[PDB]
Amino acid sequence: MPEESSPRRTPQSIPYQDLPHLVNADGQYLFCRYWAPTGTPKALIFVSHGAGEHSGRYEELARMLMGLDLLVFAHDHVGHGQSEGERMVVSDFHVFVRDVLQHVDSMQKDYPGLPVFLLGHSMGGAIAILTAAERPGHFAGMVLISPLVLANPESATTFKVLAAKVLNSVLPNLSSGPIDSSVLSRNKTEVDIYNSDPLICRAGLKVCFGIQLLNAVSRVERALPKLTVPFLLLQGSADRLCDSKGAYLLMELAKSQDKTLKIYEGAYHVLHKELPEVTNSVFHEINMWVSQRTA
Numbered sequence: 602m603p604e605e606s607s608p609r610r611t612p613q614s615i616p617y618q619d620l621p622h623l624v625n626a627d628g629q630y631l632f633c634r635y636w637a638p639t640g641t642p643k644a645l646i647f648v649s650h651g652a653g654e655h656s657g658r659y660e661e662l663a664r665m666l667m668g669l670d671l672l673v674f675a676h677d678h679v680g681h682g683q684s685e686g687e688r689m690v691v692s693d694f695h696v697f698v699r700d701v702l703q704h705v706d707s708m709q710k711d712y713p714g715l716p717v718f719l720l721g722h723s724m725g726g727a728i729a730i731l732t733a734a735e736r737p738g739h740f741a742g743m744v745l746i747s748p749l750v751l752a753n754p755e756s757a758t759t760f761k762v763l764a765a766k767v768l769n770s771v772l773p774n775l776s777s778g779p780i781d782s783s784v785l786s787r788n789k790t791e792v793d794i795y796n797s798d799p800l801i802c803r804a805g806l807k808v809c810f811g812i813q814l815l816n817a818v819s820r821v822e823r824a825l826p827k828l829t830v831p832f833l834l835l836q837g838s839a840d841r842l843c844d845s846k847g848a849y850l851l852m853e854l855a856k857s858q859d860k861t862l863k864i865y866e867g868a869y870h871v872l873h874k875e876l877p878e879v880t881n882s883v884f885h886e887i888n889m890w891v892s893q894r895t896a
């Protein structure tokens with residue numbers, strides 16, 4: 602008698618049968634998270650995390666959104682958190698977009714006729730932009746927290762050189778240095794939390810992944826005149842990871858009739874984990890923006 606193989610487990614050895622999950626088009630398990638209100642939801646909202654991190658870092662934002670009667674859902678992108686895949690490796694950046702769309706399509710089957718929003722931060726924001734651009738008119742709105750539109754100019758040069766080296770030669774171990782945690786937030790407790798979370802990948806960025814980020818930046822630039830979705834854009838003026846010039850470029854080139862930019866003077870990259878004065882405003886602004894577009 603043939604027997605069923607050992608239960609499939611997360612990279613942290615937890616069986617997927619014990620967790621909310623989804624199997625993507627490549628047969629990879631994605632870890633899922635849901636925050637549903639007690640009553641019938643007013644809308645759905647997918648939360649898209651950034652590079653090296655995971656969906657668990659959006660707990661407080663998700664609970665605020667659930668408090669507005671939205672059903673919030675997320676998954677860890679391939680190669681991240683509790684999902685399968687080699688850490689910070691992606692065959693093509695579009696895999697992230699394809700997987701967000703599969704999850705959105707699955708949820709819309711269970712909640713037909715409900716409006717669907719996107720919330721994305723950093724690389725997660727580039728994923729949200731490419732997702733909305735692929736399906737014009739499908740999403741009700743997008744909330745972008747320091748999205749990856751334009752890389753810091755120095756980092757763009759570093760990866761363009763590194764990409765051109767492996768274009769010509771075979772170097773599978775080639776990597777840049779790790780992301781400098783001190784530039785994440787002026788809130789040192791949040792810097793310390795980022796450095797303590799075992800689900801966060803704090804290794805150097807592999808060149809193959811850097812190439813996919815270069816692809817993401819190029820694709821976002823081409824997508825901007827196709828963007829019509831309503832959006833709220835939040836950006837720190839002292840962001841060393843996603844250049845503030847990108848937020849101004851997105852406001853200028855997107856065709857969206859409903860677009861708003863809020864700049865946080867002196868703030869670093871992770872606005873929803875910044876100094877309390879910034880974080881409290883970020884939460885309030887998202888709450889007002891979503892409340893106005895779900896009422």
Ligand SMILES: O=C1CO[C@H]2CCN(C(=O)N3CCC(Cc4ccc(C(F)(F)F)cc4)CC3)C[C@H]2N1
Nearest residue numbers: 651652654723724752756757760811814815842871
């Ligand atoms: O809460 C957090 C924890 O981690 C923080 C750092 C990484 N982060 C992100 O998603 N990140 C921020 C850092 C950024 C670095 C980067 C590297 C190459 C390129 C290229 F190749 F195009 F030139 C562009 C940009 C990549 C995207 C999430 C953020 N948010």
Ligand code: NA
Nearest residue numbers: 625626627628
């Ligand atoms: Na399949």
Ligand code: NA
Nearest residue numbers: 712713714715
């Ligand atoms: Na429904």
